[PDB]
Every structure is written in C-alpha cells, then in structure tokens.
C-alpha cells in the first residue's frame, strides 16, 4: 500500500535518469546545418461537397484515389477524389460517428462513435449495395479511432481507457490493451503492423505489441489530452497532437521526446496530425480553422492550409504522398497539392 | 470528354447527391433534443410519455422529435459534448426531492452550471424540468430546505421553496441575453410536459428563423 508506491517512484526515477543519460544532443542542434524546406505552397485542388453536417473522420484508400469520410448526418461517403464522384453513400444506423477506417484491401470500411460499436461494411457485394458485415460490440465507451490490420483484424481505441484488437470473422476481442488512465482518443498503426501507438486523455502515449499485448513504452511530455497520433514513415518515431496547442515528436528507440512543434500565436488544440511521404513535413489540423505544416526536423511553420470555415477535424496524406485531404466541421473536404 | 463509363459514374454520383439532399431535407425537419440529468432525476420518467447513446422518437402536432439521452456515457463529457452543438434545445431534469442527503441537488446544480455555461451551448435554450413535486411537498412538510441550502429566508411551504429552488437554478445562467431557460414543475399529471416542450421548441425555432432572415 506504501512500499508499492515507493517502489513505483523508484522505477519512475530510474526511467527518467536513464532517459536523461541517453539525452546527449537534441536534434535541434543536429539538424541546424540543413537548409530549411522554405515556404510550402498548397492549393485546394478538389472540394468534396456532399456532406451536410460536421465531418469527424476521413481515411484515404491504399490506392491514393478513393477516400471515405464520416459525418454527423449519419452518412458514410466514399469519394473518387480525382473526379469528386461519390462511389458510395452508406447510411449509418447511429448518426454519432467519430471515427472512420478504410481497409488496406479496399473491400471494407469501418465506422463507430457514441454507440460504442465498430461496424464493418462490405463494399464488394454481389448484390451491388453496401451491407454491414459485422457489428463489433464490447467497448463500454465511445469509439474514438479504428484502423484495419487486414480484412479480418481491426484495432479500435475507445473512451473507456482501453484499446482492443478484434477478429471480424468471429466478432470477439482477441486482445485488450489496458494501461491508460484516460480516454484513448487516437490510434496509429506501425508500417509493419507489428506495433501501434495510442494517445489518451491522460497526456500520455503508449506503444503496444499487437501480437500478444502489453504496453512496451510510455511517452509523456504533453500538458493536456492527446487528440491525434501518427507514426513516422520510418516506423521508429511518431508525432502527437494535443489540446495544449503543441505537437511533439517522440522516438521509439531513444524512448524520449525529440522535438516540440509550438508557436506563441497558436493557442488551440490539435485535432489531427499526419506526416508527408518522406516524413519531412508534419501536417497538423487545429481549431483555428486551418491546418499548419511543420518542418519535422526544423520545427518551424513551413506553410498554412487555410481553406476551411470551421475547425479542421480530420486530415490524411495519400500513400503515394501526392495529396493531403482535410475535413472540417463545415461539411466540406478539400484535397491539397 | 468523359467516356461512357465515366458518364454513367457521374450519373450515379448525381443520383447519390439527390438522395443525400432528400435525406438532409427530411432530417432538417426534425427537432433534436439533448436529455440531461443526474440519473434518478427522472429522465426515464420524462421519457415514458411519448450501451452507448439512446435515441427516442415521438411526434406532437405534426412535429417529429428526437431525444438523445446520453445517460450511460461514463467518459469525459468535454470530449464528446461538442457532437451535440446544434440541437434545438436541452432538456435538463432535476428531482426536487434530491435535497435530502448524499447534497444531491448540489451535484445537480454543478451539472447545470457546467452544461449551461458551455462554449458549445452558447445559444441553445434549456428546458428545465423539476420532477417529483409531490415528493418535494411530502419532504418539505417534515424536513426544511435549510439542510441543502445553508441560507434560506422562507417558510417551509411548497410554493416558496419551489420558487426559491427554481430561482437558484436559474441564476446559474451567465449568458442571460443569448439563451433562455424554460422551467416546468412537471409530474405524472397529464400530457402537459410534451405541450410545454412543444411551446419551448416553437419559441426556439422562431428565434432561429428570425436569425436566419437577420432581424433578431
């Protein structure tokens, strides 16, 4: 009751001392010799103009042409971004959806929200219509994120402070990841899909092993709830966007914060983060109604994506890196190049 | 310049757009109400006349109502409370008999203060329901209101106590200009609660319409 708390304090002391010992040079003084990327000019190439309420999530397909967007009018829309055509429009059973996923194979999409259920939709049916393939139940809080591992495995994060790995064939929870003391708001799968990171409301991000299930590392430094998380393309780092108007780059191998992406003018939380194809650009969606793009190695604003009349709620970059898509609380998606 | 398949895909997209517009027009004719309370406050008893979120549908005078009872959402309220920014009104239910102990009405006023003075619900009117008026009368006949309210200069009569409780809930509103609180001392009674909600919703809709044409 007391010796356990004292022992835990000693472990935190040891962890922080080791982290400080391994901190011999910040990458600010290491990358200072590089020439900055300069001003970044992106323009709204497309404006997807079908939704009628707040857009809460969006996900690019692996083909870098199809994207799915979830909005609060209870509609899942699949867009042909090249031509702004609506491939599908899926009516959701529950209008309250906060997350949306696109299967890497492209055969499925996932949705979830305040109904505490992750619903899998089959896109390629012989009937020609999109049918719900399975409703995954078992979360006791709202669903905040979901990411497909393959056609049969999907990992979901919920507001009940737990992340779960599902088996869509049977609909059961293969693994449960319980180490968070606050609602898990974001999720990001490693490029090799052997790990994933989750950012919760306790201002901490955790690295999990999907194969068996345990928090390998815990990353702190944020002063408020973490709303967004994204893996570096290398897979050895990740970025977090939180409510304290800052983005931080953490390092898996060094087990430390690397850089902080903050500015005095920005005082709003971050709703979404994503990296560019090479990882040199970090794009974050803010409550200032606009998205900032940062030099991931220099930590300075390389540009601004200002085209939305409300808060930018979702944001993603294509697999080939050709474009970024931002959804806002105004019912529009915009593709920037 | 499009091919035959491209033209057919554009036609399918147009059909999808038409369906989306029709469903949006149908949805915009519904009144969305957020039902809030402290559990035993009487939300179920308010609902009776008509694992995540709960939706209840009912019709009154050719008007369709959708009531969302968040209820068993034991998460951080500020994480998902912005989802309901845009509901027509908020139905807040409190139990007048919750001044006994376990202070419970103090939690009710805390929740009312948090919801009313929320950045998302800046201009959404609140329909306040004060359930259990007969239980309130029975409790007042023996226990006083001083136990829950440290300062109170009034006789142990139902009328004065209820008026003071209504006033003490109403002054918690800080944005008294842009938002109106409608109070109804509800009970089992008859279908007067639905009529009160309809009147309040009609007032809110009239204000919204005046905002749309820009003379409010």
């Amino acid at each position, epitope marked *: 009751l007391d010796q356990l708390r004292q022992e835990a304090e000693q472990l935190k002391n040891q962890i922080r001392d080791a982290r400080k010992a391994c901190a011999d040079a910040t990458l600010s003084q290491i990358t200072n010799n590089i020439d900055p990327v300069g001003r970044i000019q992106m323009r709204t190439r497309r404006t997807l103009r079908g939704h009628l309420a707040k857009i809460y999530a969006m996900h690019w397909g692996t083909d870098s042409r199809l994207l799915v967007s979830a909005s609060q009018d209870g509609k899942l829309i699949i867009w042909d971004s090249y031509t702004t055509n609506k491939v*599908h429009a899926i009516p959701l059973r529950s209008s309250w959806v906060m997350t949306c996923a696109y299967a890497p194979s492209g055969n499925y999409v996932a949705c979830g929200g305040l109904d505490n259920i992750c619903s899998i939709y089959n896109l390629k049916t012989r*009937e*020609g*219509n999109v049918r719900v393939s399975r409703e995954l139940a078992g979360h006791t809080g709202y669903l905040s994120c979901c990411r497909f591992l393959d056609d049969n495995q999907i990992v979901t994060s919920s507001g009940d402070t737990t992340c779960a790995l599902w088996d869509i064939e049977t609909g059961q929870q293969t693994t449960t990841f319980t180490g968070h003391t606050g609602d898990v708001m974001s999720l990001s799968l490693a490029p090799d899909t052997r790990l994933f990171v989750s950012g919760a409301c306790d201002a901490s991000a955790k690295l999990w092993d999907v194969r068996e299930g345990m928090c390998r590392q815990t990353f702190t430094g944020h002063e408020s709830d973490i709303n967004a998380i994204c893996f570096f393309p290398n897979g050895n780092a990740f970025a977090t966007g939180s409510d304290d108007a800052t983005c931080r780059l953490f390092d898996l191998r060094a087990d430390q914060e690397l850089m902080t992406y903050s500015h005095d003018n920005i005082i709003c939380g971050i709703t979404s983060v994503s990296f560019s194809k090479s990882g040199r650009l970090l794009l974050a969606g803010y409550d200032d109604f606009n998205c900032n793009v940062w030099d991931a190695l220099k930590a300075d604003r390389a540009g601004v994506l200002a085209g939305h009349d409300n808060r930018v709620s979702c944001l993603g970059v294509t697999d080939d890196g050709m474009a970024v898509a931002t959804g806002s609380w105004d019912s529009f998606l915009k593709i920037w190049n | *310049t499009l091919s*035959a398949e491209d033209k057919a*895909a554009v*036609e399918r997209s147009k059909m999808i757009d038409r369906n989306l517009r029709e469903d949006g027009e149908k949805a915009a004719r519904e009144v969305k109400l957020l039902l809030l309370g402290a559990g035993e406050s009487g939300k179920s008893t308010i609902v009776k006349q008509m694992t995540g979120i709960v939706e209840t549908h009912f019709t009154f005078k050719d008007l369709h109502f959708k009531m969302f009872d968040v209820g068993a959402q034991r998460s951080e309220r500020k994480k998902w409370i912005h989802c309901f920014e845009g509901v027509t009104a908020i139905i807040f239910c409190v139990a007048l008999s919750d001044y006994d102990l376990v202070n419970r009405m103090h939690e009710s006023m805390k929740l009312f203060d948090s919801i009313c003075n929320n950045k998302w619900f800046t201009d959404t009117s609140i329909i306040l329901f004060l359930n259990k008026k007969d239980l309130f009368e029975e409790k007042i006949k023996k226990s006083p209101l001083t136990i829950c309210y440290p300062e109170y200069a009034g006789s142990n009569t139902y009328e004065e106590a209820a008026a003071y409780i209504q006033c003490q809930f109403e002054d918690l509103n800080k944005r008294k200009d842009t938002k109106e609180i409608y109070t109804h001392f509800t009970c089992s009674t008859d279908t007067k609660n639905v009529q009160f909600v309809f009147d309040a919703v009609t007032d809110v809709i009239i204000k919204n319409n005046l905002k749309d044409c820009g003379l409010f």
Partner: single-chain antibody
Amino acid sequence: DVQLVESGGGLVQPGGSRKLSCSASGFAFSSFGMHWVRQAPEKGLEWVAYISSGSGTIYYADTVKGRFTISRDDPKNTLFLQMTSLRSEDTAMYYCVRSIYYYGSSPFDFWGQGTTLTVSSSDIVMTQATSSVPVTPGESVSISCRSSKSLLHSNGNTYLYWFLQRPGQSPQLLIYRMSNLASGVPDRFSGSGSGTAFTLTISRLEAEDVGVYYCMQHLEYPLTFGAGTKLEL
C-alpha cells in the same frame, strides 16, 4: 442469389408488337444499369438497348432505334423491352445483362438466361480474326482481338471486355477493361494488350473452357462485339 429470368418469347408474325420482360431477384436492381443483348440463331452477340439506373439515360442500337422501347419498373424489379414492327432480322435470343458503373466496378457481370423470339417469314468494328482454333487440355491458347479505334482513353483505362459463352448457357464476364479479372473467374485467365490490339490467354487450359469468346468494346455507344472465337476439342 443474383437471378435474371427472361419471359415473353415465342413466334411472332412480321410487324408484330411483342413485349419482353426480365424480372430481377437477388440484387439491388434499382442501382444497376440494364442492357438488352440479342444473339442470332447462329451469329454472335449484338447489343440492343440500355437504360441506366434511375432511367435518366437510354440508348438504342441503330438497327432497333425508333422501333424498340426499353423501360425499367423499379418497385418490383422488372425490365421491359417493347418492340414494334418486328422483322425477320429480329429473330434472336435476348439477354438482360446488368451493369453497375462506378470507379472500379465490373459492368456486364451477370447475364440472364435468355428468351428466344422467332419472327416468321462510325461504330467501332471489333475484329476477332480467327473464328475457331483447336485446343487440348493442359495447353495455353492466346485468343486475339483487334479494334478499329483505339480503346485507350484519357483516364488511362482501355474499355475492352472479354466474355465466354459456354455451350448451352449465357455469356459470362471474364475480363473487364482488358486487364482486371472478374470475380469468380479462375486466375488462369489473363487479359493484356494495347490500343487496337488485345489478347486473352488461358494458361493451363482444360475442360469447362470450350465455347465462344467475345471481345467487346465499351468506349462509347453503340457497344460492339467481336465475331467470336470458338474453342473446341
């Protein structure tokens, strides 16, 4: 499952006005564009009429324009072909192909069983050269097809479709847009080719593969089929 039953056949005196019906049962008929494709007693397939989902677009072949009338009736999933002034050239078997059009879709995937109607007594030329080649099980055969016009479009996809008509049943889609393999088709079938030159290769050919193979153009209407390449032995 997906079904398309044809009714309204029989023997018609010339100048008659017999109507053809096709009832769909097993798929979202309202979202599928429908086609009528006729087949003469011994000739190959010939496109007739097309009505899109929602009936907003209708196309006819020049041979039947002004005499045939196609129409859907969505509530109970029936497709009609009102034909008037029937001539001896209309003696054929009529199919009720369904085709849905979006990005990545496979049009012409399902064909009806067909009903036989007997009448008493600038388009792209899609050339299939050879009409019948002898094959043996376990071998590989490349069926060739040529187009008068380049089927490659600015979108980057060449609109050429491959169909197989096994003896005694309706044609089935094998390859759509000259590369993609249709769902349910074994991976042995492979499609390839460039503008105005397309081939279909059946690696490790065996039984239940004999029949006529038709190469079809979907670049723009009227849709034109090849003569058809017969596979026997």
